[PDB]
């Protein structure tokens, strides 16, 4: 009947598709899935707490979730030191407990609870045609996401503070006092070109700008929720869309695939929201650190930093940009767009100030430059650092590489899933998802082409 | 009646497997190639011929295990168990790399037995023998790279070893010594292989996609009678589809499956001819025109004249540990340095 | 009646020969732009500084390159990931020096093939088929975008993209083996299995169907006149072909269903190509391949050598020679 093949018409490997008309079991599936997500978030966190060592830098240990809490700034001090482990332990144990509640709710709806909530519950019941009810559920989701954004805004504005990476004297946790909420500035990043130099929203630099954009999203999603609870779709959208069960999945898959690509390009390039002290140096940052380290090396011996002509006429140490600035040389001329806090005090109006490179080098800058070229992101699948032509010296792969590659693959598969479902949903709404009918055939009525 | 009648009654009796008049070749002459490859990868070293410890007993993995070729001093002998190089001393025969010459020269008859078994069942069940002529192309490939290439080139040592990380050494061997890249026969080969891989995906994603309507549920796999006089995919509809997207489109599914037959065997035969031409050291190495122009005018620098200057960097670095029987130790000044890259 | 209604009816007609649709209005002019720039730049492009080290590189037919060595040179590394159109340049003798038509053609060609995939959805929906041709066409689109877009984003320069030419393709491949060791990577071996299995399955199916053609003609004329177009009779005895295959290898590796056979043909090489499409994207972000340097160690502590320890020497030989005039600091390629 319900869990059957020959009546439902779906095989065992297409079993989830037997839940398209079953609201209670569909709800239990989702709540069990949320239980799995929270359970992984607890388990991997407590695993990294059990394997964590505080004397050692955090990117040298292969940890990905503890930097996400350290960026918010629980149990950290100036310079990126780690003072405590109990906040990390609390963040693990709370997820590990709440996953049990969500798993119980999911198993209860998926085993005992009623299949169709539309019979005895005219609130929670929903038909896939009911456009006003779909906009209602969308409004509730948007209001919950708006409160989720305001939690981050409140944590920045009032509660402890957030670890900025642009505070002087090394990165430091500070309290945002004036979140820049200029519309003409914040809606610049959504429109800027996604190519080099300019960059898209990955070029965000200010924690004031980040928290101001979250103020915008917190207002906007609540306004959208109040919009959709009381409005219905207008006919220009009631004819443009395919209104069914699988179509709603089809839109969300393409959206979340775009989310995955944006997360990949965030985690590989940015150093503001993903700080260099916690996740490690980035791609351009490794080359800039190497060139700066060898320049500070060769400056203190007698060779000039300016007139040192390289192999081919271009500067061995300092040369120019395409747009006239003064930058490092070698192959970081592709990486001259780098802006890091260990380099920006040495950077003047035309770029690298020669007087500041003679006179104003800081010891913590020397230490950061000395360690970043050592721990540059040159991984391997068997966890051997360096180039492929390197002996088995250092067990190192940067976490940025794992985050970037994993989310790029997991976004690309969601893109393929969108190309599946957006075709299949419109084909099923049309009425030929099962094949060409042999009697009424759309081709043998048409003209030949010759 | 007589002899050669009860022996035809049996060998053509039907069971789960099918042994036949050439199964009597195929099953005994093969399966020892498989056993010898597994034995050489698991138990048997290569310390004496090459200088490489390549066994499971010596710490190697599934990727890095290989039944290795004999040394160059075993020039072109067949390397029997008995005979003038091993005298039946089985331990010394395994040490001298006779297992590769066992497995290769023993499975060369395994391919013949398999294609004759494929040819014999097609006479038993009365069908056309187009399945036989397709399998001649991997036989041509096997002969061309494992058999004819080591004969005319001073050693069985210059042959691809039966492994996974040794085939890679053979590929970089051609890339750094022969420049097998610039061979038009290899262009034919990659066109055949990659176009066959194209057309497989095209036909599979077309036929079950313009499918008819027979069942009830959306699982369209359950709606096929194997004893059917109808069709299962709309040829007219797929013709109109690929005609309006791509332009030219097929109209004859005889010719379609015959074209699927014809593409990869054409690619593999036209690669085998080039492997023969490489075995005779008639390589597709440097031209005349761009070289005599680049010796005169310094700033020329095409990708061609970068690939040549890169292949020299392959051949001067890898050789001194690839082939120790040359007995050459390059000083570091002689190597192509690149001025501190 | 109305202008917009008549225009939409023309553009979603199915009687014009080469179909257009609504993705076609981006598929057609953009690929015609890319073709019309590529034919000009393959013939008469001036030499291009690929390296940013003031060394121009000849790529076109007029300057002493034949069809094999002819190539569109990629953009210089000093240009980086910066978007560099014609109008930001000074002159057309300055746009062509710093790698212009590569930057134009790649950004055109990618949008062209994505909208072509959308068109392959759209015409299937307009005729009334089932819509999954574009899902299969997603594999070479991924394979194109990985080498033209994802890998130059990962390396931070448009230099390290694939040069648009025969002799430039191999200079991409060999230096990619040098820096990233593509052969010792499990995604790439899955793709090799994909292409070899695709060739095997194509030759095998085209053998086992052509070996069972029901006779309709004589033995003097063509064997292809036995299929009159648009009939309803199964021209190949698939029962006899399946019986021959079951006698040949296995009866439990059957695939007796023709539809299961076609699903297997549609899903072997596509999933084969998807894993290499992910493998390039992972090696773009410097997630390097395998590494078995100095694994086999004797009881003392000395170093033995294997085939990995020969491939290490070959990759050293490639690495100390690629980009021969640029690298000074000892690493970071």
């Amino acid at each position: 009947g319900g869990r059957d093949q020959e009546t439902t018409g779906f095989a065992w490997w297409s079993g989830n598709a037997r839940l398209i008309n079953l609201s209670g079991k569909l709800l239990g599936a989702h709540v069990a899935h949320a239980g799995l997500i929270v359970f992984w978030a607890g388990a991997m966190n407590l695993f990294e707490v059990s394997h964590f060592v505080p004397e050692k830098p955090m990117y040298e240990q292969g940890l990905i979730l503890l930097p996400h809490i350290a960026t918010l700034g629980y149990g950290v001090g100036p310079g990126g030191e780690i003072i405590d482990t109990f906040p990390y332990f609390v963040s693990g144990v709370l997820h590990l407990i709440s996953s049990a509640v969500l798993g119980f709710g999911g198993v209860y709806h998926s085993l005992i609870g009623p299949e169709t909530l539309e019979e005895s519950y005219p609130f929670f019941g929903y038909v896939w045609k009911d456009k006003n009810k779909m906009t209602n559920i969308l409004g509730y989701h948007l209001i919950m996401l708006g409160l989720g954004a305001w939690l981050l805004v409140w944590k920045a504005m009032y509660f402890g503070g957030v670890y900025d990476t642009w505070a002087p004297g090394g990165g430091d946790v500070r309290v945002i006092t004036n979140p820049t909420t200029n519309a003409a500035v914040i809606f610049g990043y959504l429109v800027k070109s996604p190519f080099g130099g300019d960059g898209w929203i990955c070029s965000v630099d200010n924690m004031e700008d980040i928290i101001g954009g979250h103020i915008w999203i917190g207002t906007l999603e609540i306004l959208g929720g109040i919009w959709h609870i009381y409005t219905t779709p207008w006919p220009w959208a009631r004819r443009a869309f395919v209104w069914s069960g699988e179509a709603y999945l089809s839109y969300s898959l393409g959206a979340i695939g775009v989310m995955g690509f944006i997360a990949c390009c965030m985690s590989w390039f940015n150093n503001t929201a993903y700080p260099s002290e916690f996740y490690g140096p980035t791609g351009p940052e490794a080359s800039q650190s190497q060139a700066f380290t060898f320049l500070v090396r060769d400056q203190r011996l007698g060779a000039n930093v300016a007139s040192a002509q390289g192999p081919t006429g271009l500067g061995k140490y300092l040369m120019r940009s395409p747009t006239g600035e003064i930058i490092f040389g070698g192959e970081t001329m592709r990486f001259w767009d780098f802006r890091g806090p260990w380099l920006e005090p040495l950077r003047g109006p035309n770029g690298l100030d020669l007087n500041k490179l003679k006179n104003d080098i800081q010891p913590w800058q020397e230490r950061r430059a000395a360690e970043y070229m050592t721990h540059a992101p040159l991984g391997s699948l068997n966890s051997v650092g360096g180039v492929a032509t390197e002996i088995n010296a250092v067990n190192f792969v940067s976490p940025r590489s794992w985050l970037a590659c994993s989310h790029f693959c997991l976004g690309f598969f969601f893109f393929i899933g969108h190309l599946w479902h957006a075709g299949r949903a419109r084909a099923a709404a049309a009425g030929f998802e099962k094949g060409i009918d042999r009697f009424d055939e759309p081709v043998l009525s048409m003209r030949p082409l010759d | 009646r007589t002899w050669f009648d009860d022996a035809d009654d049996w060998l053509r009796q039907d069971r789960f497997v099918f042994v036949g008049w050439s199964g009597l070749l195929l099953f005994p002459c093969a399966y020892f190639a498989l056993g010898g490859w597994l034995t050489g990868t698991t138990f048997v070293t290569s310390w004496y011929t090459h200088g490489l410890a390549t066994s499971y007993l010596e710490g190697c993995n599934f990727l890095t295990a290989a039944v290795s070729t004999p040394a160059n001093s075993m020039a072109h002998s067949l390397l029997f168990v008995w005979g003038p190089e091993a005298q039946g001393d089985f331990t010394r025969w395994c040490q001298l790399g006779g297992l590769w010459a066992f497995v290769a020269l023993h499975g060369a008859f395994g391919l013949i037995g398999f294609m004759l078994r494929q040819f014999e069942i097609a006479r038993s069940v009365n069908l056309r023998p187009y399945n036989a002529i397709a399998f001649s192309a991997p036989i041509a490939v096997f002969v061309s790279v494992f058999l004819i290439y080591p004969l005319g080139q001073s050693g069985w040592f210059f042959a691809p070893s039966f492994g996974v990380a040794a085939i890679f050494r053979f590929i970089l061997f051609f890339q750094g010594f022969h420049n097998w890249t610039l061979n038009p026969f290899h262009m034919m080969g990659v066109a055949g292989v990659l176009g066959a891989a194209l057309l497989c995906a095209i036909h599979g994603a077309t036929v079950e996609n313009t499918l008819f309507e027979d069942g009830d549920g959306a699982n369209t796999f359950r709606a096929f009678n194997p004893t059917q006089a109808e069709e299962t995919y709309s040829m007219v509809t797929a013709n109109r589809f690929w005609s309006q997207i791509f332009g030219v489109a097929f109209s004859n599914k005889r010719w379609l499956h015959f074209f699927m037959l014809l593409v990869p065997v054409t690619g593999l035969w036209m690669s085998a001819i080039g492997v023969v031409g490489l075995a005779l050291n008639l390589r597709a190495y440097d031209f005349v025109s761009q070289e005599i122009r680049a010796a005169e005018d310094p700033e020329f620098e095409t990708f061609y004249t970068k690939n040549i200057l890169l292949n020299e960097g392959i051949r001067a670095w890898m050789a001194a540990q690839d082939q120790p029987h040359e007995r050459l130790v390059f000083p570091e000044e002689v190597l192509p340095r690149g001025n501190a890259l | 009646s109305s202008l917009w209604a008549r225009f939409c009816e023309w553009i979603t007609s199915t009687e014009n020969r080469l179909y257009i649709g609504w993705f076609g209005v981006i598929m057609i002019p953009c690929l015609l732009t890319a073709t019309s720039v590529f034919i000009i730049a393959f013939i008469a492009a001036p030499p291009v500084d690929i390296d940013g080290i003031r060394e121009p590189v000849s790529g076109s037919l007029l300057y002493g390159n034949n069809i094999i060595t002819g190539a569109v040179i990629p953009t210089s590394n000093a240009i980086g990931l910066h978007f560099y159109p014609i109008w930001e340049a000074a002159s057309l003798d300055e746009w062509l020096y710093n790698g212009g038509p590569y930057q134009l053609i790649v950004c055109h060609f990618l949008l062209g093939v994505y909208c072509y995939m959308g068109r392959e959805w759209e015409l299937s929906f307009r005729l009334g088929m089932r819509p999954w041709i574009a899902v299969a066409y997603s594999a070479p689109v991924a394979a194109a975008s990985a080498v033209f877009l994802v890998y130059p984003i990962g390396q931070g320069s448009f230099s390290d993209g694939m040069p648009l030419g025969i002799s430039g393709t191999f200079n991409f491949m060999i230096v990619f083996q040098a820096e990233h060791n593509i052969l010792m990577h499990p995604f790439h071996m899955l793709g090799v299995a994909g292409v070899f299995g695709g060739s095997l399955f194509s030759a095998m199916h085209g053998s086992l169907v052509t070996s069972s053609l029901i006779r309709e003609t004589t033995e003097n004329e063509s064997a292809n006149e036995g299929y009159r177009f648009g009939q309803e009779e199964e021209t190949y005895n698939i029962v006899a072909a399946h019986g021959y295959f079951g006698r040949l290898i296995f009866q439990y590796a059957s695939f007796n269903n023709s539809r299961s056979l076609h699903f297997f043909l549609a899903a072997w090489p596509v999933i084969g190509i998807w894993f290499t499409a992910l493998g390039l994207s992972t090696m773009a972000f410097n997630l390097n391949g395998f590494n078995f340097n100095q694994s086999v160690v004797d009881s003392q502590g000395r170093v033995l050598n294997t085939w990995a320890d020969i491939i290490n020497r070959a990759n050293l030989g490639m690495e100390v020679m690629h980009e021969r005039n640029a690298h000074n600091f000892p690493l970071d390629l």
Binding site: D450 | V236, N239, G247, V248 | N66, R228, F229, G230, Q231
Partner: peptide
């Protein structure tokens, strides 16, 4: 000299592509 031969061969290949697309035999019915 040879550049004209190269260009002639490429343009001839494209011309045969053009005539193959547009001037084919019509695939006709029953």
């Amino acid at each position: 000299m040879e550049a004209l031969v190269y260009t002639f061969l490429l343009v001839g290949t494209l011309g045969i592509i053009f005539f193959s697309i547009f001037f084919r035999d019509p695939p006709r019915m029953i």
